[PDB]
Structure 1
Amino acid sequence: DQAQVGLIIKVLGRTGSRGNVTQVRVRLMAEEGSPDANRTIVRNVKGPCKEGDMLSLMETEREARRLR
């Protein structure tokens, strides 16, 4: 795997409609000053989240919702 920490920088808002999934933004604290222009990816999350929560990322360069 890749386990790449990121801090939930804020609650982006509510996306989905099941009452299940929320769409939230992740900020990379994984970087040590390595170049990232991404630089804060939006990620869909499963279950409850809170700000300052670290979580591992199995993927990077995610725009989440897209047009689909």
Structure 2
Amino acid sequence: PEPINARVIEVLGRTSSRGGITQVKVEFMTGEKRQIIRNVIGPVRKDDILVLMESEREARRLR
């Protein structure tokens, strides 16, 4: 539903064969709290606390 601000716990690492996509583990700030690996883009460090529109469309860990 409404986009949820989440919090990065660790930078899993770049992927996508261009390193363009870096996977991040995020925890929803509003109550909830769930450790889910989500694909991000751009320069991302730690505690970036990004916000995602999709919510439960989590992505697989890099293989």
Cα distance, 1:18 vs structure 2:
0.8
Classify the secondary structure of the residue corresponding to 1:54.
coil
Higher strand share: 2
Answering whether residue 27 of structure 2 is matched by residue 40 of structure 1, we say: no
Q: Deviations over 1:21-65 (max 9, x none)?
A: 11111112122xx5x6xx211110111111111211112223313
Does structure 1 residue 53 correspond to structure 2 residue 48? yes
Cα RMSD for the two superposed structures: 2.1
Q: How many residues align?
A: 61
Structure 2 residue runs without a partner (length 5+): none
Question: Which of structures 1 and 2 has the bigger CA Rg?
Answer: 1
In the other structure, the counterpart of 1:62 is 57
| TM-score normalised by length of structure 2 | 0.73
Matched-pair contact (CA < 8 Å) for 1:2–1:57: no
Shift of 1:13: 2.2
Over the matched positions of the two proteins, sequence identity in percent amounts to 52
1:4–1:63 distance in 2 versus 1, CA, 3 Å: closer
In structure 1, list runs of 5 or more residues that go unmatched: none
CA distance in 1 between partners of 2:59 and 2:29 (Å): 19
Residue aligning to 1:20:
20
